[model samples]
Target chain A: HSPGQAFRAALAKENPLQIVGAINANHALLAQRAGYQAIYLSGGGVAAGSLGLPDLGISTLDDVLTDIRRITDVCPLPLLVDADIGFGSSAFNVARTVKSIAKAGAAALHIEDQVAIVSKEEMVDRIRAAVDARTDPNFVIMARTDALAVEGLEAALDRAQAYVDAGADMLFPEAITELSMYRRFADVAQVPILANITEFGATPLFTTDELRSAHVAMALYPLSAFRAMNRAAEKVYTVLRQEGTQKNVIDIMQTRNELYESINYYQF
Target chain B: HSPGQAFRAALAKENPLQIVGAINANHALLAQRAGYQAIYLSGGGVAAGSLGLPDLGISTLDDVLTDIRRITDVCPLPLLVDADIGFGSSAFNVARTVKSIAKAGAAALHIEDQVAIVSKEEMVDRIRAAVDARTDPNFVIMARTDALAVEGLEAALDRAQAYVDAGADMLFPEAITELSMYRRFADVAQVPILANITEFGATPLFTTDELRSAHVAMALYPLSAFRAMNRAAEKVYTVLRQEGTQKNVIDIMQTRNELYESINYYQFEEKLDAL
Candidate 1:
């Protein structure tokens, strides 16, 4: 099946499908083995983890596309990517981002209103541009709103309705604090709603049961593994600096046998 | 100065200069802070570390170019890249590889005679193609001969002389075991010669003083830091799977403050606010 069709099938099968973040191809394989039905790639993670840059919009489309191709080349899981504000300010740019991301083997992408939250009409046009650009009808276009923190619940709900009217396959209402908020979005939009259950965020780390009860379709744990991976890599660098070798931290590392198994090296 | 010019300057300043391998932009920054003058991007490292694939000729020019652009975007140090067999089987492909690599901000690149070691004449033509494609005359085109252990030292020396005659800026005689072998290449070719002092390889781990004695121009420690980094990351993944939290490994990690300082985040914020 196509990655988009597979993603849709997984969405229908699993209640509140858990989507974990993978920073690279290796991490994607690890997540696939850990029993995740789908995976996510964060813009912030790409900026901080891959390029070693601050998340102030320094990364480009080529950077993200390289990572996408790498991950999809080895992994079989459907990938949902984060395209921050569709990567540009114009309708043509949004159209290009949608086509290029789908071509790069992403199943779905969420275009956020953080930078392009200029007007209701403009954001609606951006969604229309994305909807018009997809060559495959199964390819999902998710609309994300960072409007609740700035304009309150009513304005956020209104934007959600407008996005759904403009043909967004899913809605990601960012920074909703209450379970009732999810219920409200699910009831109003009547499409699959995603809950960003990220750690150390404004939203509470709601369990799968609670998200299911709220009628959420996907629970995104973006940067969970990346945060832990960063901490682990940092330890090795420090130990190498202090002890002049990785001897002390050797016990914590995954062995060559395990790495080979993960990458299926012998198959090649 | 251009990266190629900077690389030439560094080569002139240090005797048998030490070059470490960087697998990514982050590693490039770490290597630069460690007081290394130049860095390397191994084609095999990109195949394994970046793409999570075995180094069996699966990686493409795009894969290596992305890493080069990433590292050179942040790091000021000149990078010496590995272009295995010039990334293709034809003269035009070799020319494209040289032009694309130079455009990607690599200071120097080495095209090996491994797959294309079919003939000394073919390898000389490849070097000439690389030489003709470079827009920057200072952009170094190094010819790496892996003919030793297959064809013997005499064949390797003859091939090295032919490569230098074909406009190669340096010679990388791979898998030379003796210090006397380097002297032989230096005596014959008289160009800058690189000794791949990689660990777990046939070549001995010669020190800088020892390499200088042999008249070697550079010593490459490719994949040393990457091996350690892999071991470290593997430990983290194992601990995460076992303990279910990173709390136990918190103290060992580079702090958020340290990360900010390395990338100069506060300066970026200051610039944004000032603007």
Candidate 2:
């Protein structure tokens, strides 16, 4: 199904859904085979891995959305994307971030609340004005609040409540470390919630069961393959160091069959 | 000053300099700033995000390298990338993946230990043999082994070693998890080691210091910002959803100043207008 229809279905199902993190077409393919309903085109992964850099919020909206188009083309999965700071805090920039990403075929987009390296407030206000002006009702507008990291839990919860009051469909409340924080935010945020449970980060592991209890409508597992893949990379590099030939590690690799299956190679 | 020069400096500084992951120019710019003597453009990220699909590994060499050129234009860091892996897995395909990415201005490239899905190993072997036949010494001939996640760790490491023997400049090893395992391999690889530290994944979060201590010459923090940025985006969208307008979010966003600093908007506009 096209991304739009897929999201609509998920909404109708009234069930929490997950969007797998996919940085490449192969990952997208594998995500579908793994039964994910949607996929995420990570802006940082595009900028860092595809272009080679640190994620210090440097990648532009165009730079990232360009990759989103490719991923959408390959799998036709509904995609949720990382539209960082609305491409800038200006209303025009906010508008551009939304429109361009949608034009690029993203089904939904989430803007963030973390204050960038410089300048604050006014630009975000302008972005809100821009969001108010966007014409597409179906085009999603999720507001991610970074207040938890920047402010205290009370301030963060207050901020999420404010964003909800601003008309966001959901809240990606950041740094909710404890159960009470999740409960507090979900209770008052006035929208659905999507939690980021990345590996090695501060957030602990919480299954759909936990999220459901929290009233979170969506969840994302953005790095499961990335995790597996890195381990795989380390093994290959190590074997190369110890042996002149890779005959030793070859047994650990996915043969042609598994690789194809992981990515559903025949689908295309 | 230019990416061409930066790329050359990196190669001079380190043998098989670890080219970290970059998905776009901005990421490349950060790579440059973060002392990444060199960086890489992952074909998988290109296929996934640009095309909005999982990486089935079918993106064209030209398609991917074009992005590399764009990044080179903006960031100008020397680049090593996933090339030398397209068309047929023969000397010709290896040559094609290499020449296309290089022609697009990539400083170096790595082929693979595995063939495309459904393709035979013999085909990949043929390609590897051809990469060994290349005439240019500067064109990087690193080889990636995706065996461990599929076959097992030991086999994957073996393929990694073979690729180097097949004439690769570096070894792009994948799938070995434990630092202990890494220590075992680094002991004899006789080449610079790269650690792919991805957020929310298998590799534990290891700082540059940690990887260097592990005898790794090159360290790549491949995708945290992307993941973090997504979290940022999720925040943005949620605010827009809850507020029915993004007005309240005005307080917690990157201002125009930050954007200008990052892209040098003024210079870019001036340069374009000058044209």
Candidate 3:
């Protein structure tokens, strides 16, 4: 199935559905087998896992989109990839990025407005360019803003309004720690808003119920993967180093049975 | 930096060269780092590794070409891939496969003479179809034959003569157990012949010197990766089973540092930064 079908079903099925992220194809398979209706492709995860580098914009649009193709090829699940600040080129570049990602089989995507974020920006032109560059009508182009944390609420609201005017289907206003801000933005912006409630960050940990009350249409768990991978890998690494062997830990990791069950290996 | 320049170098390189098979970008990088000048992308390996399928002709030309793009993108070294039976519906389909594979950045390719392998007397039409299809003078079209084992020496030689008449640049006679048969075919083949010196199977392993003396121009070690990958992946699986982790096995595995060095990851990063 194409991404458009999965996306429409998501909007039809539930409000504020939780979309777990997959950084690679195998991970995409795992997430799909875990019974997630949809999944996100995190930019941070790509840079960190694929490249062994940090998320300080070390990865490019091609880097993340390649993973999209890989994931889409095997999994056939709709993917939401992080097209970071439209990959530092132009509006037409963002448009082509959207079109390319769609062709690569992403169900939907979120192109953020971090304001030239750790690079240069053309601002209004970029938002319009990214949205205009979208080739697939059903490929949702959600514009995210880190403004509440970077540029403040007044600026965030102004940017959100400008983005909406430029054709953002959904608004992902970052650092909306207070429920009041989320509720206020939902009431004012008059669009679907996604609440970025992450842990180990400056944002207060709000429950799904709290965000739901604020009328948020989506909630993302971005770094949950980063955390899980770190813990799992570190535990694996420690066992190998301390005892000069890993024989004690065979049962601790995912067994062939679990992997088969996870991917329904029998089915493929 | 373009594929055209890479193609020129392959034609210029001398006889008795080695081309080890690579199934992935990682394998390509390993082959490059091992001081080899060129690499091979086996259709069998792609069938076995990437798609997790057997080499019973299930994969499409586009399917193998996409994997070629991935490997070439990461490792720009000249790659020679196995275009098995021209994976097509017609003769024009063979031409399209050559065009697409070249566009995907391969410097050379060897299309096997496995035309309708399940059928009989399909070689002459298939070889002519393949040669007719690959019209580009730059893209290498090596016609391989398994008829040596099936149809014997004289029949295989007759097919090779027709393939040359049809414009095939190289001849790859798949299985010639006796050196006398290999010599007779190589002498009359009219084009450079390649010896598929794989590890196992009916085809007798001939050294570069032995083949060179027999008039063979190229010798390929397809699935040199089979051994390396088997050993490497074994380490990964063993480490995971023992320690329940990839940590201890990191030493045996190609280290992150070694991997980047092999793929020239820094150079790619530096070039982008420079841009």
* Top candidate, metric TM-score: 1
The chain B TM-scores of all candidates, as shown, are: 0.96, 0.79, 0.87
Proportion of true inter-chain contacts also present in candidate 3: 0.00
lDDT of 3 by residue, A1-268 (tens): 5586687578567566556666455555555544556777888666554444445676678767766876787777677777766776665677788788888888877777564352213556776776677666676878777776776678777777777777777788776668888876777677778776544556765555666788877767554443343334333334433432333544444543443443445564
Reported per model, the fraction of native interface contacts reproduced equals 0.23, 0.16, 0.00
Writing each residue's lDDT as its tens digit, candidate 1 over A13-106 gives: 9878888778788778777766778989999778877787888999998789879989988898999999988878898999999899999999
Give TM per candidate.
0.82, 0.57, 0.57
For model 1, the local distance difference test gives 0.81
Tens digits of per-residue lDDT for model 3, B194-256:
777665557666655666677766767675444333333333333333332233443443333
How big is the positional error of residue B209 in model 2, measured in Å on the Cα after superposition? 33
Q: DockQ of each model against the real complex?
A: 0.25, 0.08, 0.05
Off by over 4 Å in 2: A11-14, A116-127, A133-135, A262-268, B1-62, B67-103, B107-275
Q: Cα deviation in Å at residue B143, candidate 2?
A: 18
Can you write out model 2's per-residue Cα lDDT over B88-140, one digit (the tens) per residue?
Answer: 64566666666667677777666655652223355347446546555455555
For model 2, state the Cα shift of residue B217 in Å: 23
Best by DockQ: 1
What class would a CAPRI assessor give candidate 1's docking? acceptable
